C-alpha cells in the first residue's frame, strides 16, 4: 500500500542506499532499483526511468545528475509531482544547481 | 504675501476674487466664469498677463444644467444642456496671447487654469470630457501621492503638456539643454512605471544593472527632483535655471551610470549599481541635497556654481571608477 | 462579447452593480489566496536550495564513509546488491494544506527489515554499521527533499490556475459587467429623454388648448 | 430642543416650509441671540418627494430621476444655512439625514447633498444586521473639516493622531479578516492575529455604543488608546513618537 | 373556522371583505382602499384590535396612475402622480393604537398590512419606495427562496420591523429570553451570508471550527426554524412559545458547540464540528424536528416538556464529549 | 450577364430600379418604398417570382419619424409614430407566393428583403424589433465579424429561417443529405460556441479530444464554408451544389475525425487532434482551398470530382492513420 523509493546510480550509491534500507524485490521479482553498469546504456536506462515513473508505488526516485542529464529527454516529459524525482551528486560526477528538472520552474533563482 | 522689489505685499493688491457660494443665484453661478473671464479679458488688453483660475467648472457646469432644466430644454448626453461642450469651448477659448487693441502697442495674455470634478475620479462625464478635449495641459493631481507624502500630489502619469513644441523655440535660446533632458526624465519615469511590474513577479534583484539604474536614478528623481517641501524658504521657489541645473545634474549622473555599466559588462571588472551606490556615495547624498540650495541666500550664481562643481565631482568619482 | 445582454432597467442597473462588485470581491480573493500561494512557493524555492546545498555536502560524507567501509570491510557491493529480499525503509503519502490547496508530503517509515544484518560480521562491523547509519541520514535528507519538491510543484500548478482565474475576472468578466452598466445607464437616460419630450409635447398642447378656449 | 414634526400624513407643503422654520429658529437663535446651534433635518428624501410633488403640481416636466431641476439649488438653500459668521459668536451646524432609497449613493438626493455638504456619516446595513449600534461604517464616513475641529485646545493633542490609527488599523483588520477565509486561522501571523483582536474590540467597543450611553470626546479618545495598546507603540506607524510616548502608557 | 369558548365559528363572523376585481372601474379600485379603511376604523372605535388586508397598492397605484394620466396632471417618476406618496401616507397612517372617542374608556386599533407588487421585484419601484418611506414593518421577498421553494421566502436581510424597541418591554415580561435569542440569530445569518461568498468563491477547505459551526446552526436556523410549510396541519400555525423555544433550543446549541471548540482550541483533544455532528447527531435530528410538534393535539405543556428535555439531552451530550 | 437559351443576356433587363438616395426629398422614400411594391405586384401578377430588395426599412422609418415630428404627433419609443409597426407589417405583408388573378392560373412570388440600418449597431432598436416581428427570415449581421472581414457577416448565432421546414419537402428530394448535414452543421457551430466561454476563461488546456476536433472543425467551417468574399470570381456566386458538396466535405472530415479519437482514445496508442493535424496538414488545406473552385471556369462536373476526390483522398489518409 504504502509508497516505496527507487534508485539509479553507480554501484557504490546503490550499495550506499541498499545498506540505507530501501531495496526491495516486488511480487514479479523486480527490484526498485538499478545500477548502471557501464553494459547498460542510454536507452534501457531511460526505459528503467521511465518503469519507475509510470509504476505508482515507487513513490520517490533518485538520480545522479549525469544519468538525469543522460535521461534528460525523459525528464522534460516528467510533469506530475507525486513520482519525485531528486537529482542528486555523486562519487563519479559531482552535481550542480543549473538545469534541474524541478528547478526549471523556478525564473528567480538567479 | 509676495516680494516685489524687495518688499512684501500682499497679492489682493493684484488679485480679484468672483467669490460665490452654492445657495447663490444659479444665474450669478453660471455667470461667475465669464465674469471671471472678462475681467482677466480686460487686464489682459492692457498688456497684463492674468492667471484666471476657475476652482469648479464641474460646479459651474451643474449651475448651466440646472439653468438649462429650469428654461426645460432638451437634455443632453447625460443630463447636461445640448450646448455644454459648445459653451467650454467658447469659455477656454477666450484664453490666449493677445496684441492688446489700442494704439501704444502691448501684449497681453490670459491663462486659463479651469479646475474639473470628475466623480471618483471618473474622467468620462460630460464636463470632465469636454474639459480634457478643449486644454491643452492637465496637471493630474493625486491624493494617493498626497498621502504617500508626495508633495506636490501631481501625477506624472496621467498629467500632460500639449505646449511642449511650442516652447521649444523659448527653451531653445534660453535654456538650451533642457529638451533633450525632460525627455530623458519622462522615459526614466515611464522605465520605473514598467519595472515595478516585474518587481512584483520576479523580484528587485532579478532586474539588469542597467535595470536597476533606472529604479534608482528614479527614485532619487521622484524624491529629491519632483517631490518639493513648498513650506520650506530654500524650494518654495525654484526658479527655472535651478530646476534645469538638478535635472542636469541628475541626468549626467544616469548617463555616466549607463555607461559605467554598459562598458563593462563585458569586462572582468564589471560594474554594479552596488559598486556604484559604495563608491559615490558621497555624490548621491549631494544630488539628494541639491534641493537645499537657497536663490535668496545663495546667489543664482553661485547655485550654477555648486551644481557645476557637483557635475565634475560626480564625473571625476566616475573616471576613477572606470 | 461585449455585453450580457441582460434588457435595461433600474432593476437590471442594481442587479450589475451588484454583480460587478462580486466579480470584484472574487478577484481580491483569489488575488490574496494567489499572493498566499506565491509566497509559499517562493518560501518552498528556498528550502529547497538550502536543502540542496546541504545535501551537496551529506552525500559527500556518505560517498567518504561507503570508501572507509571498502577499505577494511573488501567490496560488498554484490552481497548488498544480491541480498535485497524487503525493503526497510518505506513511505507514507501525507497531506499539507496552503490555502485550499493540497500538498503531497511524504512520511519517512521503518519496517525493521534489515537483511544487511551480519553482513559486516567478521570485518566490516563498526565501519559498515557507520555507512549504515550515514545513508540513513542521506535518506532523511533525500525525503524531506522530495516532500519539498512534490509541494513545489503542486503549488506551481495551483498557482499558475490561480493567477488565470484572477486575470480572467479582471480582464473578461469585470469589462463586460462594466460595459453592460454603461449600455444600461446611456439607455436609462434615453427613457428618461423620450418621457421628457412626451410630457413636453402634453404641456405645449394644453397651452395650446387653453389659448384656443379663449 | 425646539422641535418640529411634519408628519407623514401632514400636507407636503408644509412639509417644505418645516426645514425654513427650523432655519430660520436657528438664524435667530445662532446669529442673533448668539448660540451655538445644531440644525437635525431628518428625511430630506422625504423633503425630495414634497419638493417633487410641488414641483409637478407647478406643472413642471420632471428632470434626473423624477425631481426638479433645481433640485441642487434648493437643497443648498436649505443646507448653506449654517456655518459662523464674522463678528457673532453663535453659529449653525447641520446633520442632515437621507434615506438614500435602493442603496444607491448615485441617487440625486445624496449627490446633490454630497456636492453640498462637507462629508458624510454612512450607516451600514451590514453592522445593523450584526446587530453592532450605532451601525456607523467609518470607513466611507468622512468629516471634511474634522482637522479643524480637532486639535489642541479643542479636544485633545492626540485626537487626529487617535483617529488616523483607529482608521489604518481597522482597514488593516478588515483585509486581515477577508484573508482569514482564504488561508484560515493557523495561517496567520501573530500581527495578523493582533489585527484580528483590535478589529473585534473596536466594534465591540469603541463602535457599539448604546443608544444611552455618552460619551465624551476624551472618553471616546481613551477607549480608543484602549484599543490600540492592543499593539506594541511599532505597529503604530501614523502615531508620532511624541504622542505615543506620551499617551501610550498606563 | 376558528376556536373561541370552546365552540368552532366561522371566520365570517368577524371578518368583513371588500372585493375589488381588476376589471372593476379604476375609481372603485381607488377607493376600494379607503372604504376598506374607513371599516377597519370604525370597528376600532369600538375598542376592537381590527387587522386590515390591503391586497395591492401595487394596484391601488396603478389606479391612481391611470387615474392622473386621464385628469391630464404632470407625473413623477415611472409615470405615478407626484402625490403618490402622499397618498399611501394618508392611507397607512390611519393605523394604530387609539385611546377612541366617546366616554367609555377603550382602546381599539388597526394594523394595516399591505401588499406590493413591483414590476421585475424592483425594490425601486416608486409605489415600493412610498410605501418604505411609511410603513414600520417590511416584509421583502427573496426570489432566491422563492425559486428554491424555501417558503416563507422573507428575505431576512433586507426585510425589517421597526417596532422591535417598542415590543422589548413586552418581551422582558411574558417571553424574558426571546430578545438575546433574537439578536444571536440575527447574528448567526448575518456571518453565514458573509461566509457564503468566500465558500463558494474560494472553497470550504480554509474554513476553521467556529466558521463550520456557524454555517451548519445557520443552515439548521433556516431550514428548521425558518422554513415553515403552511398547509401542514402542525405548521399552519406557530405560537410563540413554540417559536422561543425552538429558537432557544437552536442557539444554546450553537452556544455549546462554541464553547467546546473554544474550550479544545490550543489543546491536544481539539473538538472540531466534524466531531461534534458524529457525536450527537440524534440531538440534531431532534433540533430539526422541534417544528414538527403540533399545539393543537400537543398541549402547550407537552411541547415546552419536549424542547426542554431536548436542552437536557444537549447539555449531557455535550457534557459528555467533554 | 445570365444565359437564357443558351444566350447570353444582361441581368439589366430583368432589373429594376427605384432610386431615393439619401439626400433627396425624405418625403418620398415612403412612396420609393410603396412604389417598389407595386411593381413587383404587378410582375407577380404576370406569373414571375420577382423579388424586391428594400436597401434600408429603417431610412423609411425615420422618413415616418420626421414627417411625426413635423405634425407634432406623439410619438412611440425613439420618437417613431406609433404606426410604425403597422406600416411595416403592410408592407412585409405582400410579400407571399400567390395565385394571381385572372384567367390563365398563374403563379408568382414577390420576395422581400429588406435590410434595417439599426443606429448603433444594436437590434433593442425600434425599427429592428418591429421588423423582426413581421419577418419570417432574419440575417443579423456582426459589426465584430465586419471588421475581421468575415463576410458575409451573417451572425450564424442569432439569425434564423422559419422556412426550414416547409423546404425539407424540396431538400430530401433535390438534395437529399443536406438536411442532416445542416442539422449538424449547426450543432457544431453552437457546440463551438458553448466551448467558446470555457476556453476564454480557462484555455485550451483543459478540452477533451472531441472539443479540440469541433473547435478546430468549426473554424474550419467559419473560414472556409461560412465566409465569402463576394467580390471574387470563384466566391461570388457559389451554387447550391458547390454548398452542399463543401459541407458534405467538412462535416465528413468532422465525423471521421471523431470517429478516430473516440475508436482510440482508450487505447495506448491514443490518436489526437495534433496527430490528426500534423498528419494531414495537405487534407486540411484541401478542404480550406474548396472554396477557390470557380463554378464557371471549373466546371460543375470538375468541382464535384474534386470534392469526391478530396473525400477519397480524407478516407485513404484516416484509414492509413489509424
Known amino acids: 500500500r504504502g509508497k516505496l523509493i527507487a534508485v539509479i546510480g553507480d554501484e557504490d550509491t546503490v550499495t550506499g542506499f541498499l545498506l540505507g534500507g530501501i531495496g526491495e524485490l516486488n511480487k514479479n521479482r523486480h527490484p526498485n532499483f538499478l545500477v548502471v553498469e557501464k553494459d547498460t546504456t542510454i536507452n534501457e536506462i531511460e526505459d528503467t526511468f521511465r518503469q519507475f515513473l509510470n509504476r505508482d508505488d515507487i513513490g520517490i526516485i533518485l538520480i545522479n545528475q549525469y544519468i538525469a542529464e543522460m535521461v534528460r529527454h525523459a525528464l522534460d516529459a516528467h510533469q506530475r509531482s507525486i513520482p519525485a524525482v531528486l537529482e542528486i551528486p555523486s562519487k563519479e560526477h559531482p552535481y550542480d544547481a543549473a538545469k534541474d528538472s524541478i528547478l526549471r520552474r523556478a525564473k528567480g533563482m538567479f | 504675501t509676495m516680494e516685489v522689489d524687495g518688499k512684501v505685499e500682499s497679492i489682493m493688491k493684484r488679485t480679484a476674487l468672483v467669490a460665490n457660494t452654492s445657495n447663490m443665484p444659479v444665474a450669478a453661478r453660471e455667470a461667475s466664469i465669464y465674469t471671471g473671464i472678462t475681467l482677466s479679458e480686460y487686464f489682459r488688453d492692457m498688456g497684463y498677463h492674468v492667471s484666471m483660475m476657475a476652482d469648479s467648472t464641474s460646479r459651474w457646469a451643474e449651475a448651466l444644467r440646472e439653468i438649462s432644466g429650469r428654461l426645460a430644454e432638451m437634455p443632453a448626453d447625460s443630463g447636461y444642456p445640448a450646448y455644454l461642450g459648445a459653451r467650454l469651448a467658447s469659455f477656454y477659448e477666450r484664453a490666449g496671447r493677445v496684441k492688446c487693441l489700442g494704439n501704444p502697442e502691448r501684449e497681453g495674455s490670459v491663462s486659463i487654469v479651469g479646475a474639473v470634478s470628475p466623480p471618483g475620479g471618473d474622467f468620462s462625464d460630460p464636463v470632465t470630457s469636454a474639459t480634457l478635449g478643449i486644454v491643452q495641459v492637465f496637471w493630474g493631481l493625486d491624493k494617493k501621492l498626497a498621502q504617500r507624502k508626495h508633495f506636490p500630489s501631481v501625477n506624472w502619469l496621467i498629467s500632460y503638456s500639449k505646449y511642449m513644441r511650442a516652447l521649444d523655440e523659448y527653451y531653445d535660446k534660453h535654456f538650451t539643454e533642457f529638451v533633450p533632458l525632460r525627455t530623458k526624465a519622462k522615459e526614466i519615469l515611464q522605465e520605473e512605471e514598467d519595472l515595478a511590474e516585474i518587481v512584483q513577479l520576479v523580484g528587485k534583484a532579478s532586474l539588469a544593472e542597467t535595470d536597476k539604474i533606472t529604479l534608482e536614478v528614479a527614485k532619487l528623481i521622484k524624491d529629491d527632483f519632483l517631490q518639493q517641501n513648498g513650506y520650506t524658504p530654500y524650494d518654495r521657489f525654484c526658479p527655472f535655471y535651478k530646476t534645469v541645473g538638478m535635472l542636469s545634474n541628475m541626468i549626467s549622473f544616469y548617463d555616466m551610470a549607463r555607461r559605467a555599466v554598459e562598458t563593462t559588462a563585458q569586462s572582468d571588472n564589471k560594474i554594479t549599481w552596488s559598486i556604484i551606490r559604495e563608491h559615490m556615495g558621497e555624490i548621491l547624498y549631494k544630488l539628494s541635497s541639491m534641493k537645499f540650495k537657497d536663490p535668496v541666500k545663495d546667489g543664482e550664481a553661485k547655485i550654477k556654481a555648486d551644481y557645476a562643481q557637483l557635475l565634475e565631482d560626480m564625473q571625476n568619482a566616475f573616471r576613477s571608477l572606470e | 462579447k461585449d455585453r450580457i445582454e441582460i434588457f435595461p432597467s433600474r432593476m437590471a442597473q442594481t442587479i450589475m452593480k451588484a454583480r460587478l462588485k462580486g466579480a470584484q470581491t472574487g478577484r481580491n480573493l483569489l488575488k490574496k489566496k494567489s499572493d498566499a500561494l506565491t509566497l509559499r512557493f517562493r518560501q518552498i524555492l528556498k528550502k529547497i536550495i538550502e536543502t540542496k546545498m546541504l545535501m551537496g555536502e551529506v552525500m559527500r560524507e556518505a560517498a567518504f564513509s561507503l570508501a572507509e567501509a571498502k577499505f577494511t570491510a573488501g567490496d560488498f557491493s554484490t552481497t548488498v546488491i544480491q541480498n535485497v529480499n524487503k525493503a526497510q525503509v518505506k513511505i507514507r503519502a501525507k497531506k499539507d494544506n496552503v490555502a485550499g490547496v493540497t500538498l503531497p508530503v511524504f512520511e519517512h517509515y521503518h519496517e525493521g527489515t534489515d537483511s544487511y544484518e551480519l553482513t559486516g560480521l567478521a570485518r566490516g562491523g563498526e565501519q559498515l554499521a557507520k555507512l549504515k547509519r550515514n545513508y540513513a541520514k542521506a535518506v532523511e535528507l533525500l525525503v524531506e527533499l522530495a516532500s519539498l519538491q512534490t509541494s513545489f510543484v503542486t503549488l506551481d500548478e495551483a498557482i499558475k490556475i490561480t493567477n488565470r482565474r484572477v486575470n480572467a475576472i479582471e480582464h473578461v468578466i469585470i469589462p463586460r459587467i462594466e460595459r453592460t452598466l454603461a449600455y444600461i445607464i446611456t439607455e436609462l437616460d434615453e427613457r428618461e429623454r423620450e418621457e421628457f419630450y412626451r410630457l413636453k409635447k402634453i404641456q405645449e398642447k394644453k397651452k395650446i388648448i387653453k389659448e384656443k378656449s379663449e | 430642543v425646539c422641535l418640529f414634526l411634519n408628519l407623514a400624513n401632514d400636507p407636503t407643503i408644509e412639509r417644505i416650509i418645516t426645514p425654513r422654520l427650523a432655519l430660520t429658529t436657528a438664524e435667530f437663535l445662532a446669529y442673533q441671540c448668539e448660540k451655538h446651534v445644531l440644525v437635525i433635518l431628518t428625511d430630506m428624501s422625504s423633503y425630495a418627494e414634497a419638493l417633487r410633488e410641488v414641483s409637478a403640481a407647478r406643472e ?191
Not at chain 4, 495578523?192 to 474590540?201: A, C, G, I, T
Open chain 4, 60 to 250: 413642471e416636466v420632471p428632470g434626473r430621476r423624477g425631481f426638479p431641476g433645481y433640485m441642487y439649488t434648493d437643497l443648498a438653500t436649505i443646507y448653506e444655512r449654517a456655518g459662523r459668521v464674522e463678528g457673532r459668536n453663535g453659529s449653525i451646524t447641520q446633520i442632515p439625514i437621507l434615506t438614500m432609497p435602493n442603496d444607491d449613493i448615485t441617487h440625486p438626493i445624496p449627490d446633490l447633498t454630497g456636492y453640498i455638504t462637507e462629508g458624510q456619516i454612512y450607516v451600514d446595513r451590514q453592522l445593523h444586521n450584526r446587530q453592532i449600534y450605532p451601525p456607523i461604517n467609518v470607513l466611507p464616513s468622512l468629516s471634511r473639516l474634522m482637522k479643524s475641529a480637532i486639535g489642541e485646545g479643542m479636544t485633545r493633542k492626540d485626537h487626529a493622531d487617535v483617529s488616523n490609527q483607529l482608521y489604518a488599523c481597522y482597514a488593516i483588520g478588515k483585509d486581515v479578516q477577508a484573508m482569514k477565509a482564504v488561508v484560515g486561522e493557523e495561517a496567520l501571523t501573530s500581527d495578523d492575529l493582533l489585527y484580528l483582536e483590535f478589529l473585534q474590540k473596536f466594534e465591540k467597543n469603541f463602535i457599539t455604543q448604546g443608544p444611552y450611553e455618552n460619551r465624551t470626546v476624551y472618553e471616546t479618545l481613551d477607549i480608543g488608546w484602549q484599543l490600540l495598546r492592543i499593539f506594541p507603540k511599532e505597529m503604530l506607524k501614523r502615531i508620532p513618537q511624541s504622542t505615543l510616548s506620551e499617551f501610550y502608557p498606563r
